[PDB]
RNA sequence: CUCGA
DNA sequence: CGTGTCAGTAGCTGTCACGGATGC
DNA sequence: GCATCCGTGAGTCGAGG
């Protein structure tokens, strides 16, 4: 009847009563996480809800099923996941913060070709635009301007030797 | 499952107990899942079927008193043959006291057993009777018993979700001008109470946002950059504190979604639910509430509001102080420089 | 942790 | 994967002034 | 109605660990 559905739970009510602080203890001790150990606690006694033959004999002791099962559980936990990560915080001191370089060797050189495309043909200067700022392919860019493949090919070849000649007219080192 | 903004809850004073009207130490045991509270109350079907409880409960109390009454005249009766059994085997007179002795104390215990029983049928009976919303029912047989012979006339609930409830069933209006009633003609000592009160109801009934958000559905994540995993030269890995927190929310979270799934025990799902509220609780505002979570070394991780906190904090640290082209160096008396 | 004004 | 005789923190108080919500 | 207790605050900059 559902009385029976609640006698079950009223079982374990009870074995909560006097295993839970005790486990609680037992794997705070282990762990030294007192938020690991409520884990581990929940954890055992949902396996002991899973197995009747822990909770069917009462003359056998079931705490110690229980402290067996909790130590299994704490050696999984410090395996490999474990291994790498738990090691440094970086709120913990002694630990070095990320830093990114600045920008002025590269403010610097996009100033330079800034310069060095203005002195190109609306068409190469189109092109180059296309190839390395848009990042689109031969097709892409024939596509695009209406114009044949090897058109692009071709001023891409010599808008990229247009550049290395102003560029080694003002000094840009190789 | 449902879980309450620690601000609004554990910082002071309580916005919960000031909207509520709920003492701090009383929501404190309502949402940890220590005692539950009624939500609801069908007043009406309880007045309509209170004679016949009343008879139910006054002929189960009789069958009670009858059945005490009863063993402990077979006990008494057993007690008297037995004294008289051990005179007619002529033993010492002190040896029947030693058993006269054992008899009263044996009928004591039963008279007690059954006293107990009255008394819970008495506070049973006591509870159901007056039975209104916001009650706190701190002991859990009690409860148990009320939802087992009651249950079709009241609704109460545990944990985060009963709250949330009871802020759907509050009128907002209501209990504003109920604080102006006091407030207009009171007693200072009383009064003082109910102004501090309004500052918090009244915020939220002209603002127009619902008082709803002081108990959270979903919770959200900081994008990573904002806390993030660097790689040590030894190999190993090094986090943000928050990540921690994040993955015990998240760790937790999911187990609740198998006790769910499995039907488990109101026991362990209930205590679940615990551990979720005190994980996002840590989340916000580690230390908050009781022991603050500790890292390896029992160090307190940081929270989320701990980003923002005194000299260390997001402010002082980096709003309000921050430069490039600088430097420094020693100082050294210069007599020829002139004053500018 | 330690030190400088 | 299965788990089944005792099987139970470290650490620590060697801060304090001050105000007001919390509580017997 | 009041003693209790909780939570708040407590210089700036710099060097090396």
Request: hydrophobic residues 40%; without cysteine.
């Amino acid at each position: 009847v559902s009385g029976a559905a609640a006698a079950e739970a009223a079982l374990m009510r009870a074995l909560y009563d006097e295993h839970a602080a005790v486990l609680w203890r037992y794997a705070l001790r282990l762990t030294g996480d007192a938020a690991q150990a409520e884990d581990v606690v929940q954890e055992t006694l949902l396996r002991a809800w899973q197995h009747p033959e822990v909770i069917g004999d009462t003359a056998r002791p079931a705490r110690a099923w229980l402290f067996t099962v909790a130590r299994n559980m704490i050696i999984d936990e410090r395996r490999s996941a474990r291994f790498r990560n738990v090691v440094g915080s970086t709120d913990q001191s002694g630990t070095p913060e990320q830093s990114t370089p600045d920008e002025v060797n590269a403010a610097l050189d996009r100033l330079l070709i800034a310069d060095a495309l203005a002195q190109l043909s609306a068409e190469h200067r189109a092109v180059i635009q296309r190839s390395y700022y848009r990042g689109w392919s031969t097709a892409q860019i024939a596509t695009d301007l209406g114009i044949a493949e090897g058109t692009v090919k071709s001023r891409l070849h010599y808008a990229v030797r247009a550049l290395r000649l102003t560029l080694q007219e003002l000094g840009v080192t190789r | 499952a449902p879980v309450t903004h620690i601000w609004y809850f554990k910082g002071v004073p309580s916005r919960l107990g000031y909207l509520l009207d709920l003492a701090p130490k009383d929501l404190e045991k309502i949402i940890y899942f220590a005692a539950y509270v009624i939500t609801s109350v069908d007043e009406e079907m309880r007045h309509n079927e209170l004679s016949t409880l009343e008879a139910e409960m006054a002929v189960e109390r009789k069958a009670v008193e009858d059945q005490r009454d009863g063993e402990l005249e077979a006990r008494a009766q057993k007690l008297e043959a037995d004294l008289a059994e051990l005179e007619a085997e002529g033993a010492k007179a002190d040896a029947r006291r030693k058993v006269r002795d054992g008899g009263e104390r044996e009928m004591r215990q039963i008279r007690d057993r059954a006293q107990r029983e009255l008394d819970r049928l008495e506070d049973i009976w006591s509870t159901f009777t007056k039975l209104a919303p916001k009650q706190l029912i701190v002991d859990e047989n009690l409860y148990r018993e009320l939802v087992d012979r009651y249950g079709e006339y009241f609704t109460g609930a545990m944990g985060a979700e009963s709250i949330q409830k009871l802020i759907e069933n509050f009128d907002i209006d209501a209990e504003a001008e109920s604080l102006r009633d006091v407030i207009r003609n009171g007693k200072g000592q009383k009064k003082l109470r109910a102004l501090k009160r309004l500052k918090v109801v009244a915020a939220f009934q002209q603002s127009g946002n619902s008082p709803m958000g002081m108990v959270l559905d979903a919770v959200p994540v900081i994008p990573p950059e904002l806390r993030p995993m660097v790689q040590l030269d030894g190999g190993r890995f090094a986090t943000s504190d928050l990540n921690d927190l994040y993955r015990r929310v998240i760790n937790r979270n999911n187990r609740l979604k198998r006790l769910i799934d499995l039907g488990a025990p109101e026991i362990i799902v209930n205590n679940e639910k615990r551990m979720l509220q005190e994980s996002v609780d840590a989340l916000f505002d580690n230390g908050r509430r009781g022991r603050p979570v500790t890292g390896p070394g029992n160090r307190p991780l940081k929270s989320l509001s701990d980003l923002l906190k005194g000299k260390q904090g997001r402010f002082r640290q980096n709003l309000l102080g921050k430069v490039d082209y600088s430097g420094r160096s020693v100082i050294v008396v210069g007599p020829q420089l002139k004053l500018h």
